[PDB]
Write a protein that binds this DNA or RNA. Structure first.
Ligand SMILES: Nc1ncnc2c1ncn2[C@@H]1O[C@H](COP(=O)(O)OP(=O)(O)O)[C@@H](O)[C@H]1O
Ligand code: BEF
Ligand SMILES: [Mg+2]
Lengths: 112, 48, 417, 417
DNA sequence: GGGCTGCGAATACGAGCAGCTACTTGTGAGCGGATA
DNA sequence: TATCCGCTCACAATGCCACACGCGCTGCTCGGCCGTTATTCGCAGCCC
RNA sequence: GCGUGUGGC
């Protein structure tokens, strides 16, 4: 199953982590094994100033996570890239994903 | 106490700030992030 | 309970129910403050509160529902709303939000909007599906807005001259070119009465900029519509704020496909206010006007357009000339091409006490053929050919003498045969 | 996929395919923003993207392909291009570039042009071999651009008066000397219809400067050509930017050996805008004009010339006089010698409702013998000798009465025997 | 008598988070850990 | 299951004195405020 | 406030 495995990267550069991981997956043409990097982490909320409506539209706890199937080689691919500060999940090196309730919760959060 | 922790206006745009103040700021930021996680019904692994 | 029901009533009744539910002596605070105290006292009984007002989004993202008491300013009776609802229901400045609210808790200063029930007289979930104002294609005026009452009293003819000199339609952009002391106030009186009588469906809005408070309390008790004003006793910042908020409410309303009309005295005073608030750019013109100061007044006036999808937005402003300073002259100069509808008034006739003192040939309507029929517009052309070779005062007095006999303008055309 | 195919369609269809490929509710963002979101959503499926637009080279060297949605302004739908291609294919401002593009990556804000396929309707490697606009030798108008339709309806004669008062040709420099409220809009309507009908090969371009949006949506739906406009609701900076970009596109097109025609209402408004953006030099003239402010409008108008190598560039602008301020008068003064083609209009005739209200003897064409034949130009001279001793209104009405019977101007000459 | 100073009345997006070694020896205790 | 035995980690490195310098930029991410609180001036007690 | 470099008892 295309599981929603969670991982934490270098904060602040989390968008840079998202694009680096996206480019790495698109280079190795492994789309049939991996998925997205949680682009919905874009809360359009902003500080709307007068006469200047520049809105970055970025507000989320971060935690760039990739939808992926558990494999050792794939783990080595996703750790070979930079910004692998923490590969969270209760395990030695092979974690478990989260149930679909939290997936529906984050889908609601994206809906808002 | 504030007057006790090193924070003195240095020459220029920079000011000498205690190294403990960085850890204090990081602790407060992590506590705020934790408070935000539990309020949003976050998964168990992220709050862990 | 609703706020406006407690805001429209006099203060004495507020004191009565205040001491009825066990409160202090309420003859000491402001009418706004008395309303606020009554609201908290009735709210501390554990009951569902309701509020309504125009939304003003702050710099930080959150919003405030202002009420029409102080022309929607910063007040204690404003309802604070979080950006979360402003993003869910996608609200902006000018959206009239109404729904269930709750009292401010200790450490809080303003009511909080909990449930939204109606957004700009529409269902709130319907407010998400909309097109923004700068996105629809304008048009010319198609549906004729006849301002003639038909009863033909001594002042009804005041509107007929309009239908005889400059026809008005939906989405038109009108302004009065008149010197001071001509009678602009009573012409606005007649036109507002005509809007309330003939076409009561369109939203009748009157904006007063830097005028006497007697005119404010006179218009607010004559027409049955939202009258927002800004007298001279307030700074220019408040005037441009009211400009922001009224143009935003009109924009949201026409986005809701509604016909709105905004009446303005004066556009020169609003231009003065905008000149007052604009930062210095270093290029001043004759009269004391800045180079980039008139952009916002030009926007505010030219917001008028006829909507293709539905609704219309009309602006009827007044300008001052023969005032003594170059400023108002250049105002009329760069505002003379911005509008497509003019009421030229002659002080020359006002000195002879011949009301209305309207200048016929200098006035007109741009693309007026789309509001009138063929033979009717031909009647207009023949009437223009009759009035043009004649003078000013003699032609105007002849026009009023010809209208004094009949009441309806079609009947006047019928006798004109 | 192509961008314009998704930009011309209404927004509702965009929402349909948006939720078809699994996107949000698209009834909330701007039409430009809805186009951008649809573009990213269709681009994230791994497919070859195509784009097209006019190039605007920035200060730093790189460029942006703007689209005709907002009259080619700064927008999120602009395609960023690196200076490397701008040097390889040697592109400049005004070059219409079209080719394969890719989506903006994270941290990037605009699409990137990867493959160029067509530069100004030509092969991109052919754009390297070209002569620059300031380098070719001008000429007089040789090929006659007959604006007569030949069907002779009640408005076709409107163009015939042109062929009877001021002949037009390729590379000519035309402007209308007309007071306000004369009917310039409908004469431009007729001339644009005549260009679309008689000579559909030349590029028909209409530039609107500080006019009503109803005229914009009317012209953009009447003629089948690129209509770029700049209403009064936008600052003067945008107006002079559109001047830059439209004159640059015309320059690139005539460098590509093409016949282009640019229609302008108004040149006085563009001069006002240029006056607005020019820094102060300390020498102001009568009317509020600067000493070195009219150089750029003079360039923009006099860019018209007939090309020896191939192509032509024609400018038909409109000027305002009898407005009340010295400014527009001096505008017509120093612009009266810059053009070689004049349409003098009489408000005197417009008051008598005799359309077209054209002044015959004050109008004319400079070096008009190179567009007409010998006996035909002699016919023109005899017609001028007939109209000259006569008055203004009587001569104009006699001209319209003589054209009401026949449709083709050669047939009119044939009955004139 | 007058300056010095306390006392009360009139009034009107920016901060923060974050990224792009391997010649030391000696002394002590703690935590596995093998074997009868 | 007890008895030491072997592997692993914390902790130490005078005391001072003198002089000098050295402490980065940009792309995500988070919180959130009124013109009735704080500024400024008129007036009078108290010391010189 | 420290670090680094250098020198001296
Ligand atoms: N060829 C024509 N046929 C009929 N009516 C015309 C014609 N030309 C002009 N008009 C009349 O003149 C008016 C033109 O208005 P407008 O375009 O604003 O004039 P201008 O462009 O000269 O300011 C219209 O109301 C129309 O009725
Ligand atoms: F178009 Be009109 F002459 F103002
Ligand atoms: Mg016109």
């Amino acid at each position: 199953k295309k599981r929603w495995y969670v991982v934490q990267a270098f904060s602040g550069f989390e968008g840079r982590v998202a694009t680096s991981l996206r480019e790495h997956i698109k280079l190795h043409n492994m789309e049939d094994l991996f998925g997205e990097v949680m682009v919905p982490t874009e809360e359009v909320v902003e500080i709307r100033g007068g006469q200047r409506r520049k809105s970055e539209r970025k507000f989320f706890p971060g935690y760039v996570l990739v939808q992926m199937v558990m494999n050792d080689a794939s783990w080595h691919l996703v750790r070979s890239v930079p910004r692998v500060m923490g590969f969270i999940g209760g395990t030695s090196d092979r974690p478990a994903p989260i149930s679909d309730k939290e997936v529906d919760a984050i889908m609601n959060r994206l809906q808002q | 106490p504030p007057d006790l922790r090193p924070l003195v206006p240095l020459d220029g745009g920079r000011f000498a700030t205690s190294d403990l103040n960085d850890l204090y700021r990081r602790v407060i930021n992590r506590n705020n992030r934790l408070k935000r996680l539990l309020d949003l019904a976050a998964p168990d692994i992220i709050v862990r | 309970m609703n706020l406006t029901e407690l805001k429209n009533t006099p203060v004495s009744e507020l004191i009565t129910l205040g001491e009825n539910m066990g409160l202090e002596n309420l003859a000491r605070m402001r009418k706004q403050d008395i309303i606020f105290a009554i609201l908290k006292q009735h709210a501390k009984s554990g009951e569902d509160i309701f509020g309504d007002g125009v939304l003003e989004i702050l710099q930080d993202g959150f919003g405030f529902l202002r009420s029409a008491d102080s022309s929607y300013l910063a007040g204690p009776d404003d309802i604070y709303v979080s950006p979360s609802q402003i993003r869910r229901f996608n609200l902006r400045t000018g959206d009239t939000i109404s729904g269930k609210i709750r009292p401010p808790k200790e450490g809080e200063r303003y009511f909080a909007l909990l449930k939204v029930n109606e957004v700009n007289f529409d269902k709130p979930e319907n407010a998400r599906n909309k097109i923004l104002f700068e996105n629809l294609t304008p048009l010319h005026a198609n549906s004729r807005l006849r301002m003639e009452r038909g009863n033909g009293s001594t002042e009804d003819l005041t509107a007929r001259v309009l239908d005889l000199a400059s026809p008005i339609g939906r989405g038109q952009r009108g302004l009065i070119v008149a010197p001071p002391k001509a009678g602009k106030t009573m012409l606005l009186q007649n036109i507002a009465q005509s809007i309330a009588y003939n076409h009561p469906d369109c939203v009748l809005m009157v904006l007063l900029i830097d005028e006497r408070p007697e005119e404010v309390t006179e218009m607010q008790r004559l027409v049955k519509g939202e009258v927002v004003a800004s007298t001279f006793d307030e700074p220019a910042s408040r005037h441009v704020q009211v400009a922001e908020m009224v143009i935003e409410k009109a924009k949201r309303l026409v986005e809701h496909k509604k016909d709105v009309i905004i009446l303005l005295d004066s556009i020169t005073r609003l231009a003065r206010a905008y000149n007052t608030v604009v930062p210095a750019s270093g290029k001043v013109l004759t009269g004391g006007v800045d180079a980039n100061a008139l952009h916002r007044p030009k926007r505010f006036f030219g917001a008028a357009r006829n909507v293709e999808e539905g609704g219309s937005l009309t602006i009827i402003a007044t300008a001052l000339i023969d005032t003594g300073s170059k400023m108002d002259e250049v105002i009329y100069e760069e505002f003379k091409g911005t509008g497509n509808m003019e009421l030229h008034l002659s002080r020359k006739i006002a000195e002879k006490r011949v009301f209305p003192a309207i200048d016929y040939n200098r006035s007109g309507t741009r693309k007026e053929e789309l509001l009138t029929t063929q033979e009717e517009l031909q009647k207009m052309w023949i009437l223009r050919k009759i009035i043009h070779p004649m003078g000013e005062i003699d032609a105007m007095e002849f026009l009023i003498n010809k209208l004094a006999m009949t009441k309806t303008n079609d009947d006047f055309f019928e006798m004109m045969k």
